[PDB]
Structures are given as C-alpha cells and as structure tokens.
Amino acid sequence: ARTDTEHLAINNETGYRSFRAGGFTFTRDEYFARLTWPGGSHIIPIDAFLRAMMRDVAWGFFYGVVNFDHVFGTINHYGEVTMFAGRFNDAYRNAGRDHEERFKSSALMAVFKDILSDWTVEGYDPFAAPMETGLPWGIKNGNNDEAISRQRVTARRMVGLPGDTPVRTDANGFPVNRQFADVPQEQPVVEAEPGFEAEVSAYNLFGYLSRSDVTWNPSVCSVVGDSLFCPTSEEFILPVEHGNDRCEWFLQLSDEIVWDVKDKESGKPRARVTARAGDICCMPADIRHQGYSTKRSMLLVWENGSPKIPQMIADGTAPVVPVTF
C-alpha cells in the first residue's frame, strides 16, 4: 500500500501547482482538472472536481466507493484507500483499461488536502450550493483555506449532552440559512429533577440542520452502537455518485430530493427515486446514488457503521437488501 506523493511546479501562466500520488497526476488550469495515470487521461470541470474533492476530504474517504464521476474516484478500506480510473465503468473494464493503485490513507489524504488548498481561490466555497458562493474559473487568485478546513462535527452520544458536540447558535457561529428562514427555533422544554440534569436531554434537531453552513455533509447527531443518525442540509446536486459497501437508509425530513440510481459495478441507470417529507427508503449495497435538490432540504442519512459488513456482502452472508416481502 503506496505512500509516494509529491508537489511539482507552480505553473507560471496559471499560478497553480500540479501534484503526484503514485502513477496519478493532477493539474488544473482555468476551467479543468486534468488527470493522468499510466496508459490514460481524463478531464473534469474544475467546479465539479473541487466539490467532489471537498466531500472526499471532509468525509475521510467515506464508506465504500466515492465516484467523482463515471471514471474517477476512491474506494475506502479504512486505513488504506484505492484510487482508480474506470474501475466501475463497463467500457474500461471489458477492455482491461481501468487502472487502480492502493495507498495508506493519511498519505493520499495529505496530497488531497494540498490539491484542495492550492486549487481553491478567493471567494469560492466548494462546500456550498452554487447560489451561495463565487466561481472557480481563471488563474490562481488567493485562497479559501477557511472554507476547505472546517472541523468535522461528530456526536459521541447526542447533540447537546454535557461534553458532547454542541447546539448551533448565532452566537457560536451558525445562523439560519436563507432557505430555511421559516424554520421554528424554540428548544424543547427540558426539566430535570435535581441530580439528573445530565441524563434528561432534548434539542431542536430541525433547527440544528437549518443552521448547517455546508451542503451534503452527513454528520453524526445520535448514536446507538454502530447505528448512526447522520442528517445534513442538501442543495443542488450531490457532488459524487456514492456506491456504498453496505445498505444505507434515507429519511427525507423536509421538501424533496430525487435520487438518480445507477448500477454500482457498471454505472448503468436503474431507477429514479423521488422522496418527499417523511419518505424513507433503502439504498441497496449494489447501487450507486446521486441526489438532486432544488430548495435547500433536510435529509436524514442513517448508517450502520460496523466494520463487519463489507466482507459479509462480498461473501453473501449478509444481504444486498435489508428486508424482502
């Protein structure tokens, strides 16, 4: 599992740095992320690229396969990470033209962070919806390190508990997003008996989500064993096609989303799933998915975080769908 990465030259015309990770090569210009590897090249619009990179960075390579698109992406092996071109593309694979390299995670993570920092310019936030931020086009112009560096937020037990991750307020840096301005903010009435003020806990979760400053970022709010409630606020398009190595459930809390559903292995379209407020559905472990959301909307992503699942799905000792009827 490879470790070799490298900073190359700042280009004199564009002002950006190119980077290397194994056989892979990363170059940006005014419009494009340019990728090469042994035997191949590919291009991705710089805005779509940075948005995807932003997620893969923030999510620590996430669960399973993070497809930037139909060619390029990562597989997470939890401590090691596969970078690929065309691994989940019928055309490359049938032709034996896909290319894969495996890395220690903190070593790929490091060059990814360097790419994201160098390639991001003043006023461009790749964690936000396009209506909320500026543009990535043109030569290197300053940076946006504050935006690409927000601290991941994770509950040990539940938001708001003594010593656990806290509630979001104007005070502490999280005002309500313009597209959730009507969302009620009152906290639930909590009244503990003397001695119990630590165990008697409630919070306004929809108010919490309305105060999320990024889009498409599942973030832990409550924990029961490996069962994790990861709600987030969603706007525009999920900047990746997620092929999970486990089943995952979506509960639409507000407004609506359409999930474009494709085959995980081939990338052939399979179904389109429209979800409104209170709809709950399952994403099978043999699909990849990508959501589209016009108004900023509240989604609950529900995960089982157990390490056991992938090898069981491969072995067939757990199912591709959690129930049948």
Partner 1 sequence: DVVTEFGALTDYRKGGVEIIDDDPRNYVFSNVFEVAANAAPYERVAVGKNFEYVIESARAEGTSGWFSCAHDEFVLAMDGQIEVHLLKLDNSDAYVDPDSEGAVAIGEALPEGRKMGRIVLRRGHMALLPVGAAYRFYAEQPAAMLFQSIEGAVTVQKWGEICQTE
Provide the sign of the torsion angle of the four alpha carbons 150, 80, 82, 264, taken in this order: negative
Pairing mode of beta strands 65-67, 5-10: unpaired
Report which of 215, 239, 232, 19 is spatially closest to residue 113, judged by C-alpha positions.
19
Considering only the stretches 187-195, 208-216, 292-300, 302-310, report the one whose residues sit in contact with its own copies under the rule CB under 8 A. 292-300
277 interacts with its own copies by CB under 8 A? no
Tokens of 149: 């560096």
Q: Which of 50, 66, 159, 230 binds partner 1 (CB under 8 A)?
A: 159
Residues 87-116 that bind partner 1 (CB under 8 A): 91-92, 94-95, 97
Residues 165-204 that bind partner 1 (CB under 8 A): 178-184, 186-193, 196-197, 199-204
The residue assigned the tokens 């931020």 is 133
Tokens of 124: 């461009």
Considering only the stretches 2-10, 39-47, 155-163, 222-230, report the one whose residues sit in contact with its own copies under the rule CB under 8 A. 39-47
- What minimum distance in Å lies between the beta carbon of 135 and Fe ion? 27
d(CA 24, CA 174): 38
Pairing mode of beta strands 269-275, 257-263: antiparallel
- What minimum distance in Å lies between the beta carbon of 18 and Fe ion? 31
User: Does 248 appear as a known binding residue?
Assistant: yes
The residue assigned the tokens 């004199």 is 12
206 interacts with partner 1 by CB under 8 A? yes
Tokens of 116: 């994201």
Q: Which of 79, 130, 142, 319 binds its own copies (CB under 8 A)?
A: 130
Tokens of 107: 């070593």
Per-residue interface string for the shown chain with its own copies, residues 221-240, x marking contact by CB under 8 A: ---------------xx---
Residues 242-271 that bind Fe ion (CB under 5 A): 242
Contact, 216 vs 57, CB < 8 A? Answer: no
Q: Is 220 helix (H, G, I), strand (E, B) or coil?
A: coil
Residues 224-253 that bind partner 1 (CB under 8 A): 224-227, 229, 246-249, 251-253
Tokens of 71: 């060619």
Q: Which of 221, 230, 240, 301 binds partner 1 (CB under 8 A)?
A: 221
138 interacts with its own copies by CB under 8 A? yes
Contact, 228 vs 302, CB < 8 A? Answer: yes
The gap from C-alpha 164 to its chain's centroid, in whole angstroms, comes to 23
Dihedral through CA 84, CA 90, CA 94, CA 100, nearest 10?
10
302 interacts with partner 1 by CB under 8 A? yes
Q: DSSP label at 247?
A: -
d(CA 299, CA 308): 26
Per-residue interface string for the shown chain with partner 1, residues 40-79, x marking contact by CB under 8 A: xx--------------------------------------
**Could you give phi then psi for residue 118, rounded to 5 degrees?**
-65, -45
Residues 242-261 that bind its own copies (CB under 8 A): 258, 260
User: Does 242 appear as a known binding residue?
Assistant: yes
Partner that binds at residue 242, options partner 1, Fe ion, its own copies, none, CB closer than 5 to 8 Å by kind: Fe ion
> Residue 8 corresponds to which amino acid?
L
User: Does 77 appear as a known binding residue?
Assistant: no
294 interacts with its own copies by CB under 8 A? yes
104 interacts with its own copies by CB under 8 A? no
Considering only the stretches 202-210, 215-223, 265-273, 301-309, report the one whose residues sit in contact with its own copies under the rule CB under 8 A. 265-273
Partner that binds at residue 261, options partner 1, Fe ion, its own copies, none, CB closer than 5 to 8 Å by kind: partner 1
Q: Which residues are annotated as a binding site?
A: 242, 248, 289
